[PDB]
Paper text:
Two bacterial apparent OGA orthologues from Clostridium perfringens and Bacteroides thetaiotaomicron have been studied by protein crystallography to obtain insight in the active site and the catalytic mechanism. Recent kinetic and structural data obtained from hOGA and bacterial homologues (GH84 family members) have revealed that GH84 and GH20 perform hydrolysis via substrate-assisted catalysis and the active site architecture is structurally conserved. In order to identify new human O-GlcNAcase inhibitors, a high-throughput screening assay was performed based on the release of 4-methylumbelliferol (4MU) from the pseudo substrate 4MU-GlcNAc, initially using the bacterial OGA homologue from C. perfringens (CpOGA) which has recently been shown to be a good model of hOGA.
To determine the binding mode of the competitive OGA inhibitors, these compounds were soaked into CpOGA crystals. Ordered electron density could only be obtained for diprophylline. The electron density for the inhibitor was located in the active site of CpOGA, where it competes with substrate binding, in agreement with the competitive inhibition mode determined from kinetic studies. The 2-OH and 3-OH hydroxyl groups from the 2,3-dihydroxypropyl moiety hydrogen bond to the carboxyl group of residue Asp401, which is conserved between bacterial (CpOGA) and hOGA. The xanthine moiety is sandwiched between the two aromatic residues Trp394 and Tyr335, where it participates in π-stacking interactions. Furthermore, Lys218 and Asn396 hydrogen bond to the N9 and O6 atoms from the theophylline moiety, respectively. The electron density unambiguously represented the S-enantiomer of diprophylline. Interestingly, the loop carrying the catalytic acid Asp298 and Asp297 is in the ‘open’ conformation.
Author numbering:
A (entry chain A): 41 to 624
B (entry chain B): 40 to 624
């Protein structure tokens, strides 16, 4: 009857009935014409939900019909009842569930696979609402770049991530882990046979999930440009790219982010020649991706104009090349429309975004657990390619990555708070509410210098703390608010204890120190209220006791590796410690 | 060529007219018999201290000093002034001309004469005086200090010393309301017993001798009754308390409502009105009554552009002659912009009195407030004619900020807070001034993280250089030169503080010893932070871990100590460095 949480939000969805229960066995129509990856995804779903396939038809049992628009299948047409994927953009699809029948029509193969993923999300306990849906992405390339420093994702993390992207309609995965010598330290060298199977597994998994596996080369460590050596090194770049092509790689990136020979003309020459001699020569390779040595607005621009390097790079690099930038800074609050317009103007095309959130390599004590935040909802005007750099913490990165999927697939309707709530609801099931209490305190990233991004920590509790100080300093009665805040702090502690006892090991292993840290702070916040109450009661012994406890809790948090809620739970203790009620 | 020395306050009008001259070891004194008595005593005190004798009979070889008031008939004074005059200046005004062996001081009144002397005292260095024409007068009529801080009281000797300091800097108001004198609050009805008489007399006499109005602060809010027979008894107690003070020589009074448990605006106002009528008006020689209403900062007084009930009623009831104090937009606040003064003064339909809560540190005692008057609108005088600051329990170090309040209130229009700050330290600390500046520069900003904050930011130039260090490092720009420069600043900080520890007089050192040790610790931690950065640039892991451990111990020592200084600068720098991972830029 009711529509389950969906992610991404589909473009068009209307409830057209009251839904029905899918029978224990079903009629499968189109299984041989439809996209193989979509059909394999469907079969895996039905198999896991104990829904058998009928070898012969039966008007009683539910009928599921699947295929592309370019297929002449009139059963699909009949089931679709007008609505079609014919005029939708790439990766788009139509889905109709109406009395005992579900029709999935992709605009293409990719689109068909996405139709299935939505279907999977619509079904609960063999029940499905009945709706009419047409859907397609706001932006063409949506995904993740594995560009963080620190402990690398394991082979199993990547495989799991790859499936998670497919399931959320993310179509891009840029493979450039700092731990793989063949992306950088041995960039010339083709993969040895002893590495071939691992790579093949990533390449295959990506393909079966409609994910573009982008191989990222950073030749900057030692590439040469001039004379015979430059020629040799260029040929090695070709050599390497085709050994990868022979494994099935069809997307490439070349990074100039870390080179010291800051020569714009030479960087772009290598890109242009690679583009001619490889990308275009092959015909089925996707547009070349690049990161220029200047890759954030502050490094790219002075006074509304490009700097020397960026001016030359933008003038030299072929228009068919995806150029990545990070926004106004490497790690920064926002990408407002005006920033995208500026950089897009300079490069005379739609840009690619490398968004350093929720990555935490620069401030590892803190987990980044908030939604996409600060990215203008009109960005698609100037951006055709959107990626996020995640944490070394693969599992917990799913919260933020989940909201990125929504932002990039349905940008105009993206609401960061509802997206954030939905991500945790869909990922954490019965522990969703407790996870929210904890994660609410861990959204803001800030290394106290050059790197800051994210939604503020626990903003509503922050507003309440502010009101307590106003009331106390204005001689107004705060007894009801003090009471409310004790409730807030007890609830922080309780939720974190719950998460400790009940979280899956795969999540708990990423966040146990931060859980303890939040508990410590909740206990200090409580002791801080005790100080205020002692001063209102003029009780010197109760004050001194609360004060030593509050101070100890704060000292524990400060010296601990884990970091959380700095401006809210932690700062509150310092505010209370410096507050002297006797002065008014 | 004798240059003009530092002067405080900055005189309204000063023109250098000659190259200056030497004041003989013996001088001719002309007018000392008709001129203001306190002014003359201040002059003799100065002459004596600088081994300058007074000629018994005229001697045409000697420097001639002529002193008097405008309405005094002295032909030598008129001749020496050569057209310059104090005749059309406001009260406390005076003229001073030093020209060719003659120094003429003409006050518009007795107070102005005294202040002419104070300027003369500042003009003379080693018997040399510049040749200048001066006409001078204050922007604001009442300038001074309220002893209104919580904490350890000023001693009797601190107060006597403060009063003399006010006289030298032309501050004419001292509001005596120490929390720890019972007769001010806990025993407000009771007149001073015989045991306390000498002590009170000394303060009153020292104030008068220094042209300082000694305001007695009464806080009856503790237990004053308003209705019926008890209300009548308490009002008569107020009257008999005030006349016992009057008999001791007190001519200024403040009555406070800041701490009363009710908000009975009409009753507060009627007590003042009646006191005004039966005492202030009746005596004829009592200055305007001073009050602090129960709501005394804009936040407590105003809601949506309009007075709150208490304020509206108090404003409606209180007599127009009464001085009403407010502290600005908050009790302890960054600024009083012109608009705030305009709003409150409009509500009260009168020129307001300011109770400015800086350099008071009672709400964050680990930090010394060593900055200038900061955030006060330079056109505030349009709406304000009474300016006081609430200082620290630390009487000696309060002089830096008070010195700047003297200059802001006497010469408001030309007040430059950086220059006033520098001049305050130069004039107070002599040979240790440059070192004192290094230290005090890290201790101007007050912030308890909640309701209270005010003052110039700590060490802003250094803060801008630290910012630029992180900009360079995160932009992969070479930072060697800046790093070297910062090593120099941190070494300077430590060396200034060590010299201060060794050479500060005990009266100053006593108040700042812990803060000195704290700045040294922070400086050492700052140096260690640089060593961390350098070790990361050199890819030296062992050098990194060793610098880091020092940085963290220095920071930890700073955080756990009572003393607080340079929170956003020297202290924050270490935390910034500890959170920065250079290995990934
Ligand atoms: C634009 N860009 C990055 O921002 C980046 C990177 N490797 C790491 N980062 C950013 C880092 O994760 C933020 O601390 N690479 C290889 C990159 O090209
Ligand atoms: C306007 N006002 C004050 O601001 C004040 C005060 N006693 C203390 N203060 C302020 C305090 O020193 C700052 O914490 N009194 C008695 C007062 O009238």
């Amino acid at each position: 009857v009711l529509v389950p949480n969906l992610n991404p939000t589909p473009e068009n969805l209307e409830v057209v009935g009251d839904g029905f229960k899918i029978t224990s066995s079903i009629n499968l129509v189109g299984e041989e014409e439809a996209d193989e990856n979509a059909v394999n995804a469907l079969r895996e779903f039905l198999t896991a939900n104990n829904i058998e396939i009928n070898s012969e038809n039966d008007p009683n049992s539910t009928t599921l019909i699947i295929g592309e628009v370019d297929d002449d299948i009139p059963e699909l047409d009949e089931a679709l009842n007008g609505t079609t994927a014919e005029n939708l953009k790439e990766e788009g699809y139509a889905l109709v569930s109406n009395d005992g029948k579900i029709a999935i029509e992709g605009k293409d193969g990719d689109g068909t696979f996405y139709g299935v993923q939505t279907f999977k999300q619509l079904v609960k306990e063999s029940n499905i609402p009945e709706v009419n849906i047409t859907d397609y992405p706001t932006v063409s390339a949506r995904g993740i770049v594995e560009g963080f420093y620190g402990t690398p994702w394991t082979h199993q993390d990547r495989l799991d991530q790859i499936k998670f992207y497919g399931e959320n309609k993310l179509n891009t995965y840029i493979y450039a882990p700092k731990d793989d010598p063949y992306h950088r330290e041995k960039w010339r060298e083709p993969y040895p046979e002893s590495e071939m199977q691992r790579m093949q597994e990533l390449i295959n998994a990506s393909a079966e999930n409609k994910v573009d596996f982008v191989f990222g080369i950073s030749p900057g460590i030692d590439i040469r440009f001039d004379g015979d050596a430059g020629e040799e090194d260029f040929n090695h770049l070709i050599t390497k790219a085709e050994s990868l092509y022979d494994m099935g790689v069809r997307s490439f990136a070349i990074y100039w982010d870390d080179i010291q020979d800051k020569s714009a003309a030479k960087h772009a020459q290598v890109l242009n020649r690679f583009n001619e001699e490889f990308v275009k020569a092959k015909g089925d390779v996707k547009p070349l991706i690049t990161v220029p040595t200047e890759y954030d607005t502050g490094a790219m621009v002075s006074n509304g104009q490009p700097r020397a390097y960026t001016r030359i790079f933008a003038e030299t690099v072929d228009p068919s090349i995806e150029v990545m930038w990070t926004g106004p800074g490497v790690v920064t609050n926002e990408i407002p429309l005006s920033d995208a317009q500026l950089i897009s103007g300079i490069y005379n095309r739609n840009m690619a975004v490398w968004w350093n959130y929720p990555v935490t390599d620069y401030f590892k004590g803190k987990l980044a657990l908030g939604p996409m935040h600060g990215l203008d909802k009109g960005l698609n005007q100037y951006v055709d390619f959107f990626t996020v750099n995640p944490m070394e913490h693969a599992e917990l990165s799913k919260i933020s990555i989940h909201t990125a999927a929504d932002y990039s697939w349905n940008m105009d309707n993206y609401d960061y708070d509802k997206a954030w709530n939905r991500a945790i609801d869909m990922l954490y099931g019965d522990l969703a509410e407790d996870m929210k209490v904890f994660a609410n305190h861990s959204t803001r990233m800030d290394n106290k210098t050059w790197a800051k991004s994210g939604r503020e920590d626990a903003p509503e509790l922050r507003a309440k703390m502010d009101e307590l100080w106003n009331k106390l300093s204005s001689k107004e009665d705060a007894s009801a608010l003090i009471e409310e805040l004790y409730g807030e702090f007890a609830r922080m502690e309780e939720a974190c204890n719950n998460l400790k006892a009940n979280l899956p090991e795969v999540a708990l292993e990423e966040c146990s120190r931060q859980l303890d840290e939040l508990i410590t702070l909740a206990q200090g916040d409580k002791a801080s209220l005790d100080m205020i109450v002692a001063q209102l009661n003029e009780d010197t012994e109760a004050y001194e006791s609360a004060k030593e406890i509050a101070q100890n809790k704060l000292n524990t948090a400060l010296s601990s590796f884990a970091v959380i809620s700095e401006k809210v739970a932690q700062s509150f203790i310092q505010e209370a410690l410096s507050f002297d009620l006797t002065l008014i």
